[model samples]
Target: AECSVDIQGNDQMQFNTNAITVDKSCKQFTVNLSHPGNLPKNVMGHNWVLSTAADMQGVVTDGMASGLDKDYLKPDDSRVIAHTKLIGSGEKDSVTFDVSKLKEGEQYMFFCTFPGHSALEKGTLTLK
Candidate 1:
């Protein structure tokens, strides 16, 4: 459905897809994340995190310091538009956010905030 997106993460520290488009008609947006790898969260954790493209780095920076106890994200971080829980092998999690948080022509980003995963597991989120 246009209201949601499904993504998969692997033990190789990678997200299955890199880009997502949100339909403006949807009042809300949902992200579904599933980990298909065999590694545990402590070794290969994955979580879907959302923020403006500009704030991505800062979010990841703070997330790293926050540790996995906070899903690798800062507690109640304003910069974070949405996020799923940190998950590992055969795990699943989801997060929903208000579509009003998105704006046309603005650059939004989605990534994994598991320590260094953001560098390679990031993507663009466009309002369509």
Candidate 2:
């Protein structure tokens, strides 16, 4: 495996990990996200979204307005690099992006945009 990681999002708006590293040589990088909280998607759902730290707030603002039918992500939003679909308890989703899309020295970040969750669910991403 090309440095795949299993991350968890709970009902309390927290992520299991604070950092993730990706192997640059890999053809693609994958993030497997899950919710083990026993809550419904509308109440405590979560999704893994990747973007530059600079664009985090703006991207999340638009994502929240996009609604669940759209996976809580703005469709065709160029600011988002990758994202797993919104998932509820016992549900899982993954986002695989081409490794070539990552640039050296650029700091990427991941977080959940389910309303207020971003305050607790945020982390750093690096391509090694």
Candidate 3:
């Protein structure tokens, strides 16, 4: 089965996708992110940041403070499960994480490490 997902972010500060699911047979899963908008990275960039649902704000808080240099995430923070690099319009980035990192039935959340998400940018993930 295909073990990859395509997600889009735009100049409007939103993502076109809201959820992702990993197949039971997939030992590894890939989250591919692309920016189809015309904005620059400094103005509107996005990344796929993954973690437990409960850690959402905590991760975002640190990520925001860490700034764009670290892709808005702490350098190799133990809580982060997976993430793509901050990408600008016309740019694409992807991140792969082990399926084992996710436990069944546990709440998981994924996000864009940027500001102002008024659409599908924030999300839910699960293993199938």
> Which candidate number would show the highest lDDT if scored against the true structure?
1
Candidate 1 residue-wise lDDT, 1-128, digit = tens: 67999998899988888989999999999989999968999999999999999999999999999887777899989999989989989999889899999989999999998977888899999989
Best first by TM-score, ranked: 1, 2, 3
- Residue-level lDDT of model 2, residues 1-128, one tens digit each, is 35588999988889999999998778788889988968899899999999998999988999889887887788999998989888899998888888888888898999998888888899999988
1 against 3, candidate with superior TM-score: 1
What are the clashing pairs of model 1? none
Quote the lDDT for 124 in model 2.
Answer: 96
Error of 1 at 13 (Å): 1.2
Give residue 35's lDDT in candidate 2 (0 to 100): 89
Clashing pairs in 2: none
In model 3, the worst 10-residue window by lDDT is 112-121
Model 1 clashes, total count: 0
For candidate 3, the per-residue lDDT at 12 reads: 85
lDDT of each: 0.90, 0.88, 0.84
lDDT of 3: 0.84
lDDT of 2: 0.88
For TM-score, the strongest prediction is 1
Worst 10 residues of 2 by lDDT: 1-10
Q: Is candidate 2 or candidate 3 better by lDDT?
A: 2
